[PDB]
Amino acid sequence: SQIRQNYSTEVEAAVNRLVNLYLRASYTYLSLGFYFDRDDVALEGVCHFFRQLAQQKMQGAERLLKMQNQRGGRALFQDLQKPSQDEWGTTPDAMKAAIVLEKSLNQALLDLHALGSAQADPHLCDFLESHFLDEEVKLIKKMGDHLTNIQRLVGSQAGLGEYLFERLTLK
Amino acid sequence: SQIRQNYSTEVEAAVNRLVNLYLRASYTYLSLGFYFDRDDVALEGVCHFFRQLAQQKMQGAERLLKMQNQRGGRALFQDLQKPSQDEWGTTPDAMKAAIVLEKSLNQALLDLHALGSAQADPHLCDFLESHFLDEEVKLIKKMGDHLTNIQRLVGSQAGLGEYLFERLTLK
Amino acid sequence: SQIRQNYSTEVEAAVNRLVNLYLRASYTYLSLGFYFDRDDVALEGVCHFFRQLAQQKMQGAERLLKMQNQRGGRALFQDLQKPSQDEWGTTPDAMKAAIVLEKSLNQALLDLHALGSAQADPHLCDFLESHFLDEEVKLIKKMGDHLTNIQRLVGSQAGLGEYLFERLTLK
Amino acid sequence: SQIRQNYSTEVEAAVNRLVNLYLRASYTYLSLGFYFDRDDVALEGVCHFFRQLAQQKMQGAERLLKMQNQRGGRALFQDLQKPSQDEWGTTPDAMKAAIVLEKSLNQALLDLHALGSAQADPHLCDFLESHFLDEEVKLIKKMGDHLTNIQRLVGSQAGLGEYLFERLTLK
């Protein structure tokens, strides 16, 4: 490559794995979104929440691919495993699942940052910090808030609590 | 002092004590606000309510200090005791606590007004009346209203009532 | 905590100590501001300078508390020690004091950053860099500039130099 | 009088004396203003300061007369003694004189308020509080600030300090 500089093969590979992880998260959220659009589920604010997250993860993938090219590395795609469930249960089940998913993305980010720090790759480390690590922290906090509110509502009376949460918290 | 006139040492001292009381109330509300921002509490309208009150009490302190200087007295600061609790319970627990706190500030105002009246200090008495006594009455009435509504809601079903109050009453 | 991830107990504790330090700095600046509002001191541009800094430090505290909650840690407040002086001397005395105070806040930031780097906490490290470390550097430079100008003016003729600095440099 | 109610002859008389005091203060400020307009004094910001105060005191007189009529009392005017000096010295001399004058007006206000309180005349007491007592406190604080600044400047080098104060503090 005419441009590649201070960009290790280990980081290149790790960035390709992370792209796969973001794409797979996007796919997961797409499934979650359309489950909540089912006529027998019918929670539009929940559908919209997860569809917006599908878009966000696809944007993260695209930003990682842009950077891979900026650095002179080469994007390599792998098969995308389908989401872990076909049906996602109640709102709290789905929010727990999303938190698990985001924590796994955050751990992959942290691992990538440790690797870049080990390879002395300050551009990679700043990239991740600027665009990814704070967005994860903020989203996980928002999801944790939502879980606490859903849990508090479905303790009381489950159907009514799910409706109220979708109507009064979700867009 | 070149400006001091009809301003007793007793009032000067009492005004410094009241500044400490307002600052300590501010600190209390700051704690209350951030407890309701915890991911395992997660009541944003409650957080916002108490953060606005923290700002209001700090403003009261600053107004008392401005007056102390206008009169030729001298501000003296003391240590600020931390708030009485680390965790604030449910919304009704927190609102009861705030009412207790505001009643104690109102009693300090009333005591200061009695002292100024005993010292024949009509400026002090008008100052307190204009900026402090009516604001307290109004805030305590608002808090009492909120407690009545929260209590009526958490009698029914506690988690659901707390959510509805934060969503439909609080900003 | 349902959200906590890669957030050590050491950092949590250190962040709570830093909140105390920012609050105490705020309190210090509040005292400084109101001393310069005394009728026998009467330097309005100096009062305004320190009152704006009191607000800024309170904002720093609030941002640290927001982050502590975003990460799943728990805010704990301690008593706030009163400021180190009741009377702050001349403008140069007060500016020296503020520089000492800001250097101590900057060292606490640097210490916290070293701890986060030791605990491999890149979010904490980016947080501090983005919001705190550059603001400190910039403010200390501004204070150093002010001290140099005040010192150059009060070498000449002290009362006149203090007035000119407040009128022609301070807002 | 068809309207007079709870308005003692003592208060009526005291209000007429206070009108005389305000008019005489106005006259004093008029003299002060025109002394600073002399070609051999020539401090325009000082002239403007005292001319604005002459207008303010005349406004206070007119407000006291409006109230005397609102209450059913009867205005009675007495001769106005000329100001205590023909020439007013330096800026600090003149500011000291104004502070002495305002303290004497404030004491007359306080005396009138004590009398109204003794006669159980709450309208009079609120009138004085609303329109007069806080305006005095604020003006005396402003004058005290000015004296401190002038004194600090004329300690250094008297002619230069007087000029700088008129240019950089006064409108």
From Swiss-Prot, chains A, B, C, D:
* InterPro entries for this protein: Ferritin, Ferritin-like, Ferritin-like_diiron, Ferritin-like_SF, Ferritin_CS, Ferritin_DPS_dom
Keyword Lipid biosynthesis attached: no
The entry marks the following residues as binding Fe cation, namely: 52, 62
Q: Name one GO cellular component term.
A: autophagosome
A molecular function annotated in GO for this UniProt entry is:
ferrous iron binding
Please, which domain of life does this record's source organism belong to?
Eukaryota
Q: Which GO terms describe its biological process?
A: intracellular iron ion homeostasis; iron ion transport
Q: Keyword Iron on this protein?
A: yes
Keywords assigned: Acetylation, Cytoplasm, Cytoplasmic vesicle, Iron, Iron storage, Lysosome, Metal-binding
Compartments where found = Cytoplasmic vesicle, Autophagosome; Cytoplasm; Autolysosome
All residue ranges annotated as the Ferritin-like diiron domain in the record: 5-154
Q: How does it assemble?
A: Oligomer of 24 subunits. There are two types of subunits: L (light) chain and H (heavy) chain. The major chain can be light or heavy, depending on the species and tissue type. The functional molecule forms a roughly spherical shell with a diameter of 12 nm and contains a central cavity into which the insoluble mineral iron core is deposited. Interacts with NCOA4.
| UniProt record similarity statement | Belongs to the ferritin family.
Question: What more does the record tell us?
Answer: In horse spleen the light chain is the major chain.
Function according to Swiss-Prot or TrEMBL:
Stores iron in a soluble, non-toxic, readily available form. Important for iron homeostasis. Iron is taken up in the ferrous form and deposited as ferric hydroxides after oxidation. Also plays a role in delivery of iron to cells. Mediates iron uptake in capsule cells of the developing kidney. Delivery to lysosomes by the cargo receptor NCOA4 for autophagic degradation and release or iron.
Write down what this protein is called.
Ferritin light chain
Origin organism lineage: Eukaryota, Metazoa, Chordata, Craniata, Vertebrata
Query: Which gene specifies this protein's sequence?
Result: FTL
